[PDB]
Amino acid sequence: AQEDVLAKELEDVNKWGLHVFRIAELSGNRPLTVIMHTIFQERDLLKTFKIPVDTLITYLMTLEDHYHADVAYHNNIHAADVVQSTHVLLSTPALEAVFTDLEILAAIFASAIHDVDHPGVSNQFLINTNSELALMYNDSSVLENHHLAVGFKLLQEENCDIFQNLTKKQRQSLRKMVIDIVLATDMSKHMNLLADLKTMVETKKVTSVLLLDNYSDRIQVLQNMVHCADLSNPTKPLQLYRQWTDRIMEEFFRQGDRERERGMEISCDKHNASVEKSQVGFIDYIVHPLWETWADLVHPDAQDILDTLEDNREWYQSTIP
Amino acid sequence: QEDVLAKELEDVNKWGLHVFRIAELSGNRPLTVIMHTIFQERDLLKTFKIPVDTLITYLMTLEDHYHADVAYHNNIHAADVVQSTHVLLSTPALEAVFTDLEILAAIFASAIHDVDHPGVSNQFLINTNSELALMYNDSSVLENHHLAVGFKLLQEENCDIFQNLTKKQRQSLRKMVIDIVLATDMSKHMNLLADLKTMVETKKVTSSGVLLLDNYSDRIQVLQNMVHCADLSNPTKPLQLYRQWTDRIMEEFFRQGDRERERGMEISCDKHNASVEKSQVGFIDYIVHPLWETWADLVHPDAQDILDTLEDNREWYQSTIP
Numbered sequence: 329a330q331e332d333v334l335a336k337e338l339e340d341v342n343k344w345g346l347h348v349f350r351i352a353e354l355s356g357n358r359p360l361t362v363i364m365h366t367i368f369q370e371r372d373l374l375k376t377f378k379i380p381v382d383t384l385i386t387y388l389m390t391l392e393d394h395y396h397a398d399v400a401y402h403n404n405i406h407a408a409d410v411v412q413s414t415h416v417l418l419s420t421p422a423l424e425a426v427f428t429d430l431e432i433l434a435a436i437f438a439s440a441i442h443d444v445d446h447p448g449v450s451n452q453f454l455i456n457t458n459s460e461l462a463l464m465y466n467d468s469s470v471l472e473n474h475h476l477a478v479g480f481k482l483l484q485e486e487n488c489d490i491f492q493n494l495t496k497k498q499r500q501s502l503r504k505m506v507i508d509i510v511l512a513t514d515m516s517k518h519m520n521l522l523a524d525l526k527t528m529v530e531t532k533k534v535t536s537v538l539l540l541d542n543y544s545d546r547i548q549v550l551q552n553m554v555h556c557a558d559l560s561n562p563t564k565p566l567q568l569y570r571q572w573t574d575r576i577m578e579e580f581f582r583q584g585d586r587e588r589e590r591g592m593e594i595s596c597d598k599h600n601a602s603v604e605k606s607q608v609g610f611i612d613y614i615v616h617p618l619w620e621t622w623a624d625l626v627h628p629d630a631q632d633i634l635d636t637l638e639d640n641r642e643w644y645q646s647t648i649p
Numbered sequence: 650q651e652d653v654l655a656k657e658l659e660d661v662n663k664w665g666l667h668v669f670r671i672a673e674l675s676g677n678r679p680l681t682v683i684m685h686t687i688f689q690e691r692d693l694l695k696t697f698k699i700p701v702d703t704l705i706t707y708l709m710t711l712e713d714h715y716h717a718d719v720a721y722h723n724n725i726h727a728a729d730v731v732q733s734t735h736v737l738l739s740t741p742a743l744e745a746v747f748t749d750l751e752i753l754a755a756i757f758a759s760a761i762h763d764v765d766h767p768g769v770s771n772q773f774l775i776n777t778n779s780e781l782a783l784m785y786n787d788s789s790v791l792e793n794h795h796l797a798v799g800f801k802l803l804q805e806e807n808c809d810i811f812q813n814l815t816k817k818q819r820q821s822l823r824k825m826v827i828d829i830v831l832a833t834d835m836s837k838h839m840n841l842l843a844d845l846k847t848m849v850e851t852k853k854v855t856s857s858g859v860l861l862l863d864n865y866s867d868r869i870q871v872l873q874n875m876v877h878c879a880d881l882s883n884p885t886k887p888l889q890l891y892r893q894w895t896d897r898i899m900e901e902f903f904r905q906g907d908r909e910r911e912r913g914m915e916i917s918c919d920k921h922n923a924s925v926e927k928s929q930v931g932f933i934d935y936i937v938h939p940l941w942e943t944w945a946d947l948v949h950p951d952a953q954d955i956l957d958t959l960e961d962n963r964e965w966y967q968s969t970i971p
């Protein structure tokens with residue numbers, strides 16, 4: 329009966345605002361595994377790429393295992409939500425028959441692994457406390473390089489190589505794209521990514537659907553697409569959004585509590601925080617400029633997402649005065 | 650022995666230092682003694698309040714992480730790049746341009762720039778599905794690892810030569826060292842060269858022809874090209890040095906070839922099928938000379954003696970071709 333309700337909730341996999349937190353309770357805490365299996369079935373990705381079903385389950389569970397169950401925001405539920413959101417953006421009418429099967433595979437895999445083994449703390453925290461991770465990666469996209477190293481490394485585990493039947497050319501190319509996509513999720517790169525997206529909207533070329541052309545534009549589109557999915561919480565129905573905020577504030581406060589345990593200045597402070605004002609500014613300066621520009625690329629496919637974000641923005645603002 | 654090395658070292662400020670003899674007479678400690686002399690000379694120990702024993706401890710531990718069994722990418726190559734940078738930092742046209750901190754980073758970077766090199770290329774490591782390429786997502790694989798090793802060794806007991814620096818000082822130098830080492834990757838050559846060409850066209854300079862570099866972007870860029878130049882300086886040294894570096898890179902390459910043929914890899918590096926001579930002319934013409942000429946255009950006329958040797962060696966190597 330739980331499998332019954334689980335399978336019912338999975339009927340909404342193609343819809344913005346899927347009940348991701350319920351799917352997580354109903355799956356026995358395997359949102360990423362169940363959401364990823366259902367998406368591969370939907371898009372016929374097992375057959376196309378000859379992925380044995382048992383290998384795909386075995387990898388998915390191992391990766392899911394490598395998201396930390398004690399990090400409030402950057403955990404497996406978030407990875408799941410990011411995969412399903414890229415899945416929906418990939419389906420936009422303005423991009424129909426634009427991306428190859430291998431590019432579709434790259435974007436969804438990249439979404440799955442994009443935050444794996446996330447410690448619940450910022451790049452800057454890891455730089456300033458002189459941690460193994462920052463020493464390893466020379467202070468440069470430290471977390472995102474790690475996510476990638478981990479997401480690939482897990483393919484080598486027993487019965488875990490989901491790409492065993494791709495050609496060597498397919499695999500080299502998929503690898504390069506996954507790396508390019510996942511490094512583009514570092515927020516220190518947001519302003520530069522959005523510049524390029526604006527330029528592409530401004531020089532946009534369309535059919536009587538979107539034309540590309542060359543690897544450089546296609547990759548930028550995929551990079552911006554997964555960044556949008558990554559920052560999609562404030563575009564979701566408000567009950568989903570509000571839970572996403574409580575979780576990121578918890579993680580943010582746990583980090584400030586560790587910076588205090590150290591005599592570090594506090595970036596994060598649970599006796600200073602102004603949650604509602606911070607969310608309004610997040611949307612106004614970061615989240616709305618990205619989604620406005622994305623909506624422009626795919627006009628008018630994303631109008632309802634954009635209307636949703638604007639409503640949520642107003643709601644949060646309304647809590648202030 | 651301690652007398653001969655004393656005297657050989659008195660040439661530390663000269664292009665064409667007898668670096669192989671120094672390695673010999675120091676008991677394979679050329680990076681320790683060359684770095685040590687340099688810090689004394691430049692007065693880097695008083696300026697940065699470095700206890701003598703800490704530098705020595707670090708330098709020895711740093712040098713031990715160069716592989717003795719790799720024919721080019723070892724501690725003699727790291728002693729050599731260090732010394733070559735130290736001389737280029739003394740270019741008339743760069744007089745009083747860089748701070749004591751920036752001089753320190755250039756020279757620290759030089760020293761660590763190849764540490765723990767396996768004697769094989771980034772493309773090898775990407776093709777052998779290596780663990781280092783897995784870790785660094787195929788980007789500047791070697792170069793990222795050299796840095797992470799260099800900095801980690803400072804945390805060993807009595808190896809933190811930076812202990813008496815302030816916190817802003819440590820951040821800044823850490824940043825500079827990384828930008829400088831990442832620039833040693835040859836994949837980045839052409840892009841750095843174009844940028845240096847840009848700087849020369851639109852260059853500034855006082856009435857002594859001393860260059861004026863205000864912002865970080867321009868100064869780091871110069872220190873990047875300066876250490877890249879030092880790395881690629883072997884063809885510009887006296888012939889009896891150049892030849893010795895060339896035999897050594899050719900051995901390292903032919904050994905990578907062996908490691909390949911073996912593993913069933915397509916052999917890249919091929920000893921039963923290379924012209925050492927023609928490959929050197931090729932290398933000078935397409936990479937080393939466009940580089941040191943452009944550098945020469947920046948500090949005109951100061952790099953003249955250097956560019957002249959480079960062109961006299963190209964001529965000699967081309968004379969070895971029937």
Ligand SMILES: COc1cccc(Nc2cc(-c3ccccc3)nc3c2C(=O)NCC3)c1
Pocket residue numbers: 513514515558559560561562572573576606607610
């Ligand atoms: C892509 O990398 C990263 C890294 C850290 C946080 C995020 N996301 C957020 C940040 C913030 C936030 C909070 C206070 C000040 C500034 C920003 N608020 C939210 C999210 C989110 O996506 N969901 C819920 C609302 C994304």
Ligand SMILES: COc1cccc(Nc2cc(-c3ccccc3)nc3c2C(=O)NCC3)c1
Pocket residue numbers: 833834835880881882883884894895898928929932
């Ligand atoms: C900085 O990165 C790297 C990597 C590999 C070789 C080098 N340097 C050389 C390469 C080659 C060479 C020879 C044949 C074909 C292509 C290149 N010859 C020489 C050096 C050198 O610097 N000293 C001795 C002469 C530099």
Ligand SMILES: [Mg+2]
Pocket residue numbers: 442443513514
């Ligand atoms: Mg992330």
Ligand SMILES: [Mg+2]
Pocket residue numbers: 762763791833834
């Ligand atoms: Mg190197």
Ligand SMILES: [Zn+2]
Pocket residue numbers: 406442443513558
């Ligand atoms: Zn994320």
Ligand SMILES: [Zn+2]
Pocket residue numbers: 726730762763833880
């Ligand atoms: Zn080198």
